[PDB]
Amino acid sequence: GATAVSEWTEYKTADGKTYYYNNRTLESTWEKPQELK
């Protein structure tokens, strides 16, 4: 069907930040995405 926006892994930066690494289209996000609630 439709290709849902997702694919969110865990990427920890040296400051201890839980940031997400968009596998969707290869992108980065600091905190929670729109669909990731």
């Binding site: 930066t13 980065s28 996000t29």
Partner: peptide
Amino acid sequence: PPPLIPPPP
């Protein structure tokens, strides 16, 4: 090694 994030507009 981790990537730095890009900033949001």
